[PDB]
Amino acid sequence: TYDFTPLDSIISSWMDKGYYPGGAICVVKNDSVLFEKAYGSFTGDTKVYVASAGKWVAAAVIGAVVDRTDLSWDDPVEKWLPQFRGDAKGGILLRQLLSHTSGVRPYLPAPRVDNYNHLDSAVTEILSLDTVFTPGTRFEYGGLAMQIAGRMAEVAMGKEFEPLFQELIAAPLGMTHSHFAPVNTDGGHAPMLGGGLCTTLNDYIRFLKMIYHNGRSGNREILKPETVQTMQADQVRNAVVAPGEYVEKALGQHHTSIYGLGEWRELVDEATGEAYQISSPGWAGAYPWINKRDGVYGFFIAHVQGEANKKDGFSSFYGSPVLSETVTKIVNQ
Template sequence: MRYLLFFLCLSVQAQTRYDFTAVSQRVQHWVDRGYYPGAAMAAWKDGKPVYERSFGTYTPETEVYIASAGKWLAAATIAAVVDDGKLSWDDPVSRWLPEFTDVKGKATLRQLLSHTSGYPDYQPKGLHPDNYQTPAEAVAAIRPLPADTLPGTVFHYGGLAMQVAGRMAELASGKEWEALFQEKIARPLGMSHTHFTPVDPTPGHNPMVGGGARSCVRDYVRFLLLIQQQGVWEGKRVLSEKAIAALEADQVSPARVNPGEFVEEVRGNTHQGLYGLGVWREELYPDGRAIQLSSPGWAGAYPWIDRISGVVGVFFAHIDVSRPNPEGFSSFLGSPVLGTMVRRTIMNPEPTGRPLIPVRKGMAQAGDAQLYYEIAGNGPPVILLHGYVLDTRQWDRQFTELAKNYTVVRYDLRGYGQSDLPRKAFLHADDLGKLLDALNIPRAHLVGSSLGAIVATDFAALHPERVLSLTVSGGGVSPDPGPDVPFSPEEKAKRQKEINEWREMRMPRTYLLAELRMNSTRPDENSPLFVAAARDWSAWAFLHIGPRCLLGSSVIPKLPALRMPVLVLHGEREPTAAAKASQALLDRVPHGRKVTLKSARMFANLDQPEAFTKALLAFLQAGK
């Protein structure tokens, strides 16, 4: 009964405090598409439940194999043995397994759990896979395999090394792995639905220590709360603070990290210290402490802890690969967007009481991607398109004001904010058209900043009959070639060099923040937005040779045919390239005019919000 009461108030709190509509729509879409037969999710903030929902065939207590989400549980179990003084993080393999006489025997327990041991990731093709063996049998099969690298030199994500770590814990404690996990973690936390069990019924078989656990959402939340509470559960210490610190610390540096690892793909982060012991360090503070920790599984499981928002969250599902694979959907890379969406919801809650202007949030389908949007107000439609690095939050100072007289829509472009990352060739202008279709908006006023200005211009050129007016700021026409022009070998080489330079810089968020501040005449006032944007940006476009998603210079011949009113809101101090881009538009449309906003740089709506909004409203009202 206490276990049920523990979760009783979830739905009420979620409804009264936070709007998780877009989160639920995202997961429901995955289930509707057949990616998952069902799913379950929960989020807690500051030790209190704020969201719980089940989808399809799942309930919060549905047990599911969680693949690599079990690595966090495994590392915590071993940490408990270290707490007992029976193991040391720096014990070499050979101390407990003397038959490891080659270089693999020199790897330490710390390196085994941080994927820096030099062991191969999985059993080579043609050998028995390492998923139906006891740790002792697994170790016997791993011992003859050659090492990939010297211990401590390269980060190489995989599972074999964790089998060896589990066997070391068995020998040190004198207990089998499942019994050890139950004693140290599961029973103290009341995780009655969580076990390291085989995926076949053969007695005595034990799946991978780092990939064979099964659990349910309600159980795993308890584990995350234990970690968030520095090893204490219901007033009793389960793990020491020292153990928690070891799990969360950078355990990779100075080993080499190759491009394309998980945190780069989902967060745009290429920092060196991307992994602790059994857990990814997705985002870091400048001093190296972890902001967001996670342990994603290939089949869709995604547990995380977010130090910024005070949230722990769990999403559990198990993918049916026959459906998403042909569509390019990756559950391993897709689920982490839920952490971003929950953070945004938590940190931008609806006002208590009745909001001044109700805001509807949701996800719209645009081809193979989902786009996050917000809509408010009544009247002629106005679409707000954000700039590079930024997202819907760029329009906070215009959104409510415009909604007094217009139906205002703002959305995250593909690759930004809470919208999907690109998976194949697309046009931002096509995405905008599909968004308008999904919202049943036949025609609208378009307002774009920077990248958004180019997207708005592209859409107006392709679909002039759907545009009531066009307002651009900090952009307008891209000088780059359009999508019909393939990348030349020289262009690809240049882009790859730029990508490598970004990776070598380890994508410091302080650098992005500095760039944003340099493009503002009110950097201190705009700093909260810039900090959030730099932290949340996926940097996908910076780290991939992606498709040409803008019409580029091919839009120029179409501009003289545009008959809608066009306004250029020019920042007096905006960069020369941005001024040229908007002037290229203004020079070619028949009904265009310019308003200069003094002391404004790239993002004029942020530097001069009152003047920007006033000029925009005057333009929109004149065109009624």
């Protein structure tokens, strides 16, 4: 019998200040739902564009392809996409694309925006762009590199990325209201993999349950256990992490191993190098997480109105780990 008042108070205060028009949360501990509540206009089935919350899901689609084909985390781009031969980008590894360590430019040069609904067209435009640094040498967050990662999975399966998501992840989990494409163009819900995901509280909770159980759902192996472990491992490695990236800024943690495959390693045990809190926050307030020490997975879904970073110091991106912090307090007496 936990007391969830402190969490409810924080979320209600965001609604009372008009930061969001609505929202919903679900917190699960040791496979029991401890707290589930919708605010404002929302239900569990309200569809929301969740931006970077989809990076976690997109990495899982690619992991399901890696499980089924000769595609591997250490494959170079040019093995699969021969139009990249002759370009320094051809030697980028799949794991580097998904860990923000590729050196591919973060977003198209202004005023262009990658809103492509087909990755083959997206990747042709990305091919023309100079890199910003040598692969593996720096961490820099962005969206273009994951377009390339997605296209490599498309080629390995002979099938486009959105249909792959439905075949390999959404259908087997019973996610019925989710999609990466078509891409909404209102701003900040693009490119496809990095920011395109539209989902619901009920859909994304099914995804997190799967991840929490090391890729199993019931009697099905949705991802191999090793694939889930690799997604959660240090994929930044020796890349230089600049001061003030999300983990340092939002959580105060100073490890360099801040990212896996499409997911942040928010809290890490130094002695083992294992991450015990993992997340994929979006700029507009969506915050999914797992805390292995708590035995918790949860998801807050919402979309900020106005700017993400407001004059009272609230931030729908950098403020989000208050949710996992408050749950950690609650579930440990």
